[PDB]
Write a protein that binds this ligand. Sequence first.
Ligand code: HEM
Ligand code: SF4
Ligand code: SF4
Ligand code: FCO
Ligand code: CL
Ligand code: NI
Lengths: 304, 300, 581, 581, 179
Amino acid sequence: KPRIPVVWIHGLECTCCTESFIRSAHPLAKDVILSLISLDYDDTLMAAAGTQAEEVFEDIITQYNGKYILAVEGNPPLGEQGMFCISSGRPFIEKLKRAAAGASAIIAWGTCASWGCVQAARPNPTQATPIDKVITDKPIIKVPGCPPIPDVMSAIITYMVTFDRLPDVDRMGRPLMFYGQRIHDKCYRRAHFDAGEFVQSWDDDAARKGYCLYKMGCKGPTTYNACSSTRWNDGVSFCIQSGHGCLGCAENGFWDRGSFYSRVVDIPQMGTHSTADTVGLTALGVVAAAVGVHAVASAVDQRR
Amino acid sequence: KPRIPVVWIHGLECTCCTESFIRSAHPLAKDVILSLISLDYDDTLMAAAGTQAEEVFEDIITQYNGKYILAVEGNPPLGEQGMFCISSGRPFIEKLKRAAAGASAIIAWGTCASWGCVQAARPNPTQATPIDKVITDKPIIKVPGCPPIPDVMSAIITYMVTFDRLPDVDRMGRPLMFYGQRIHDKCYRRAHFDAGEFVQSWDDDAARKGYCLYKMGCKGPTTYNACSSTRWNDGVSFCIQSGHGCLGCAENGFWDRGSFYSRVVDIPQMGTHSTADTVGLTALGVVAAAVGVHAVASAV
Amino acid sequence: STQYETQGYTINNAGRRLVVDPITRIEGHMRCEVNINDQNVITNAVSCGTMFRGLEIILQGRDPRDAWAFVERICGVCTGVHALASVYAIEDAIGIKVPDNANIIRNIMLATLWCHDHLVHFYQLAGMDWIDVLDALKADPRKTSELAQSLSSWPKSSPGYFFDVQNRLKKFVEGGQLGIFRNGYWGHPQYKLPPEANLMGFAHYLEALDFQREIVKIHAVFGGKNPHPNWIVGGMPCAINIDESGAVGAVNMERLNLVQSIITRTADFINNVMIPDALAIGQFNKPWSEIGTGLSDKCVLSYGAFPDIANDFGEKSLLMPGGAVINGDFNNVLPVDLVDPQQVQEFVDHAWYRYPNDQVGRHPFDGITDPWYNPGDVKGSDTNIQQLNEQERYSWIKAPRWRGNAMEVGPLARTLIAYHKGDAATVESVDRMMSALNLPLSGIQSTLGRILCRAHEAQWAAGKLQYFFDKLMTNLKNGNLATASTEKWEPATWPTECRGVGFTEAPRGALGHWAAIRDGKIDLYQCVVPTTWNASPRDPKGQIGAYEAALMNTKMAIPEQPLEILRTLHSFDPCLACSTH
Amino acid sequence: STQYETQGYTINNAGRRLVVDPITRIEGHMRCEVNINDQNVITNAVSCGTMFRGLEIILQGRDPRDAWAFVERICGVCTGVHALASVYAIEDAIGIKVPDNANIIRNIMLATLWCHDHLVHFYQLAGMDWIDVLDALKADPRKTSELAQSLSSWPKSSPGYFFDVQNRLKKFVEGGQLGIFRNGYWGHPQYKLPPEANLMGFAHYLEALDFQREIVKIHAVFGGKNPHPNWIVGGMPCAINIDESGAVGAVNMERLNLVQSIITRTADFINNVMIPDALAIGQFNKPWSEIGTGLSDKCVLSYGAFPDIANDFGEKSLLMPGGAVINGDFNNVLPVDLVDPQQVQEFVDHAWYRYPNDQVGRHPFDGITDPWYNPGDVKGSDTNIQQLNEQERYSWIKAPRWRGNAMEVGPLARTLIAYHKGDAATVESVDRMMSALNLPLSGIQSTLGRILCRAHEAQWAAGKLQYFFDKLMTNLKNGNLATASTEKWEPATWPTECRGVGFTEAPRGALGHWAAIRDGKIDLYQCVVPTTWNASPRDPKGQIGAYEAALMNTKMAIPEQPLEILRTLHSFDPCLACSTH
Amino acid sequence: VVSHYVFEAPVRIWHWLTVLCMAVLMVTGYFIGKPLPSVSGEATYLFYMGYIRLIHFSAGMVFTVVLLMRIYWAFVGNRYSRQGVWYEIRWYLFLPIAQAAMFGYFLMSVFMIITGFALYSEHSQYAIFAPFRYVVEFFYWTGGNSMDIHSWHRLGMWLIGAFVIGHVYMALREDIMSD
Ligand code: HEM
Ligand code: SF4
Ligand code: SF4
Ligand code: FCO
Ligand SMILES: [Cl-]
Ligand code: NI
């Protein structure tokens, strides 16, 4: 009958993960909090501040020691003795370590907690390091993405509560359900990528027909998430559907893999129609010069 | 300020199109009826029955002659003097003609009104014929699908009201927006297709990973709709996502194009069954024996 | 004019003849004709189906695995039930047994169809028979608020809310474009709802027409789309993946979450909008518990439905019980058998079909769908029926009879069968419902009875949805994932010659598909649909169908305005394309 | 302990020191410290941002077209505003000029952020300061119903509804797992809502936490996703196709329909749930129109936002007006210039940063983000701050000053600037709002004033949403479709060396991005964020920030329970990751 | 255009090209319809169905252009130009007909081109291919979908195969009989 206690801490973060979690459509963010788990500590939502909030924290990690789930959003800085993120007058990394040692398992929310995200991009001034580099004695589920898909977050939660176990994971620490397949492999525009039909510059004829964004630097070919399948915000849309290439925001160090707008190295591309087209025009051209000498038309289409 | 009058008739139909239209999420079916158009006649929803319903019909087609839109769902039968569908004691085809002549434009809803759908599949007992074979003097927009996607129906409606014009059509009468591209063209499982990754039998390891359904006879490769892009029921799912191949239910005579679970299918002119393979392999073995006869004729 | 007695009724075609063609707020095409006397009482009723497509004919020579797709398109309103009936039958024929989850899913599909179908009927179709739409304009919003709050814990009830609804309708009507309310029956003395209840009703009419669309998302998940979802012989296509690589390609924890949320919302809606409105229509239109009884106190039929033990259509498994009552003896609920040729029969002596001998009845395995339009002396012509000839052939609907008996099927039948069989759940649901209305048990055998049961059934169905979901989840928890059997998917593996029966309860009554296979091809496929039972013409013995029976002895207040007729008819939930196929 | 006067205030660090660390129900990490006297009145306030990531440093040497993506991740609460500020600036630098629709869409994105952000703050963050959650358990549902109905035409108001809400909360609390309400402040004498208003409030808290999710679907359409949508230098990626083949690959009539429906629902919700609750919190907590005034009656600032003429950031175009007021002279609303080095400056003599000379202020184009943590004699250690040393460096937040003046930015600022500029719309919205509360105009310059304005702003934003939509549709009607410019997309076409300013009004206040380009690379990128203004430390002259100012002279009822502190702070809507970046 | 210029070899170099394209077309084409057994895992990095699709399309090009000019030569080199008489030539030639395999072959490959390009150009390349959009409009008038074009196309393959079986005997009948 009692709900399972969850502690939710925040390090260096933009709060996009807590923002995402509450966007959940099924189950409702509301219903998760009132019926599925006992969200016992979360700086972003809780009533208690200051020495009252300090007191809830201590009371919860004490009374449910060994028994509670630790959600972490954002990451700890190591620079300047960890004081790039101060919590209750002390480095954040200390609150993390004390909460971690008392937890049974740890969810690492978003690219921040999983990998490092933006605060950890070149030159990484705060020396932000992911949770798996700081907490090495506990099970950690990495649910990456900047943010992860709300319904995926909630779905992961419901899996854990309903099935009373941790989701299956790849060698990386990511739940297999939503991170087992690349965006590029469930992309609704694959048909175009397969043909060799690409957007070449924004709002061109191609883009208007929803051709492939591969050449606008889409990084779906190397990004494991569920955006092309599950999609964002109650299945409304996702990066690619809305005309922009995948940034790869669920992938380790994606901020540093060149520009968002450039190709993508080492993904095999060979167009069905594009190549055949070139073969046809390349053969026509051979006969064109051999018998005629090229084509100066007059109608150019004629068929009406 | 006044809303545009719409007359909605039904021939031989299953009513899947009127059911679909009301599933619309945006704008709401409700909001379409109360704000966007004046749905002045619809057998399935209206208060008036009998000689009251006859009276509304007559009154609306008279008072708005030349000015109203004619929605047609289902199709007219030609057999048994058209009495396979009786309306007010008279063949349906008469009600259609009399509503058509008074209309400014015609929306042929679903595969029934567009193509013929199920009632018109072999041996076609009622001789169901599509609207465009019976009404030849009016503009007809074909919005096929058994049914068409609810939000597509409504979207087409909103296009016509907001832009005050008929949607642009392929050389077949379908609005270009949603029927300009094939399902196979915007299939989320395309990656698997070209890869060579197919479901072989239902619920197999492949099927669980959501591989291509081509080999389970998916007809998406030859079916113009928007189900892979727009999707069904507030973008929840569609045939392929939910594990079944496209039947091609927006395409002309799709009921008669072989089995649904089959790639290489019934050529209806070749009769009973006889598929491309069947007839080809029949011919192949014919000439294979015609070779046997002239080789046995080598009297050297 | 001729007169004869049948089933305790005196059928008399003398006196003024009234014609209701076309019947509206039903599925498909119906014509109704009656006779009234000096007291404006119906002494003759004529139930004609004015459409036919011929699915039975079309199906022949088709791959049995393609059949569900064809016959699903029998009806778009009861979309999916025919497919279910199909797969059921082909499996019965070949001898295929589906995996548990396949069943649990199929049952979800059906419970969903019940919830949706019943709701849409109650408001969009039947509602206006009882709710005087235009009278809402004379309602006080504050009292409408106070009323709705007294009947229901439903949140949407503010006096401001009913005021906006009223104003929007006032806006709608104000322009002279009544649309669907045009030339309606408003102000008929049989409209008995007070101003405030009319507004409360109409507001619920619109809320329902909004909410209905969400229920079918459950279909969209498993079936792929609604209307007209997808199925397979062997189980279900919608393979389930819960915690392996590529769960994005299957039914997964997120998808199941969607379903779950729709279940909760559907249950909540039915229980707090429809259910209270049903009881409230019962409250104010009370004398209708004695009008339109028809066959319901003589002969009722259920096949049974919702098999909880997978691939077990037996009594100890079907959550919705089967059985038949005849001659008003409800203490002896007889077992129904669909194979038995002396049980389900179809006479066509009054239908537009051709038999070798048209005086005998054919059991569906011997069925003959040979269309032959032939109305006879109709006083008009073949292309102009002014008045059907009920002495001869007069409908596209075949006349089915259980052991020669004329039956009523549907929600009311299901309830009496369930009740008198002793069903713990149903004895508590009916007794409290009738006690709430201060009406006796017999009050349920009526035009009002039919509406009340339908609403009860939606409540039941939505309850059952949650039950089925839970069942599915327990399997998933317990590592049971299989959704399809493929062992006998190949035709090479089917009996060279075989036959089977598919049966369930469609929202409108008892559905059966009889199918025969020969060399991988459909040899025969015959359909006996719920409305075929209810809207049935007469048979050789002159016995009348459920419809014509329920219309008899009904008092009409205004003869040219056939509300009393419409009320009685709609309460059965007519579905003509279903009945004719 | 030392004492000095500043801005009409007497800053005194003698007397008991109170420490509120960590501040909750805000975005990111904040520490607040105060001093109280014998009368329990705040005589000193200390505003410390306890986080830093260093976006300005990271951005250096990246492609300016990649910048929006990096800086969007400054904040996930005000998600998207920083991207907008970015594109604006890179376009200002290169000299880009976007198509009309691109703007209309961007304005939509912002209005959407306003609607959503404000709503979530009013309920999820600030709400509990005013609504005694646990006191709802002592409310009578019938009176709670009667109250809600007196205030609003909102449909969800049945006595049954408030009863379920109460019961669900009673179930929640009954187990000893108060969760987020654990060790809260309930029963504090500053909670002034009656039982019934508390339940009405809490029911709205949940309804809001549900509805909020739907608003962002507008982002999902155009942006692709929310949080953190996508953008491009040159306009917007979300190409539009309405009537031509392949409209399935673009923003089409169906997609626009979705957006439309969200606009309607968002407007309706804000107007009937938030707006009434705001006024109602105003009604019962009335003496708060005189507590927490701060800088709001001395110095306020707006840059301006929502350019209606495309690529025209002038006064005649920005729908949300810009301007600054200093010394309480609101009759002379001064023009703001972001290029001018004698206007926007940033002093770091009290922040953990390093300057060549730390006594001067640097305009953003000369900005230096060199982190240098150095707290000094804090009576504890470097790794254990028991008490910050406000005499020296004490925050990760830079101190920005407009012309040396300490400013307040945000909803209240925007309103006074808009009002005193003569804005026809704003003079009618404020005058009626204050007249409804029987409070004078000056009542708006307060902690309560701040909440009221925010609510008014959401109302405004949702109205403007519909406006922007319509504008976009009129273009589509008129064959105008272009969504992006691509002439200067190539780096080969950019000036070898150039700089630009991006500016708008984020939900919290005035936002500016100053960017410098050299050889297709970011040379410099500096950010001055709304909360950086508000939560600002002191400067060389010892002047205090908007926060520390609003906390001064505030009476505390219980010192160990800092509700009065939280109330004042939350009303500014703190966003610390924004303030620090 | 990616390449330019060759010159031209002897004419039999263009026969061999056909037969090769022909064979390649048939194999690949067969497996478009009845695809090989499914492969497994990580779609990004594999693309089998697509190559047997790509080779087919481009083999088609080389084939079509080789045949268009193979014909262009045949009837300009003929000088026979540049119903009544076709029912009088079959009535004194009944009173060795493998020249009706030249006509059959010719027409079959032409038929294949038309059907195939109706299918290939239907992602409307809009370029020169508009004529082939009548072919689709035809098959709809016929009774049904673009699906039929597949069915009929495939039928062409088998029928073409029949002419090969009828050729390679007729060939190896005289190649063996070398008296
Ligand atoms: C005599 C030479 C040819 C042969 C033997 C051949 C054979 C085939 C076969 C057997 C199919 C499978 C259709 C099915 O079973 O559904 C096919 C498909 C196809 N063929 Fe050909 N064909 C030939 C010529 C051409 C030409 C000249 C083109 C022009 C580009 C072409 C383009 C296509 C296309 C576009 C498809 C459908 C591919 C898909 O579904 O993605 N074919 N061909
Ligand atoms: S847009 Fe990206 S994920 Fe989609 S098909 Fe093109 S390359 Fe693959
Ligand atoms: S399932 Fe059908 S439409 Fe989808 S990729 Fe496979 S063949 Fe194409
Ligand atoms: N319900 C339903 Fe349709 C009917 N009658 C079926 O079966
Ligand atoms: Cl899952
Ligand atoms: Ni922010």
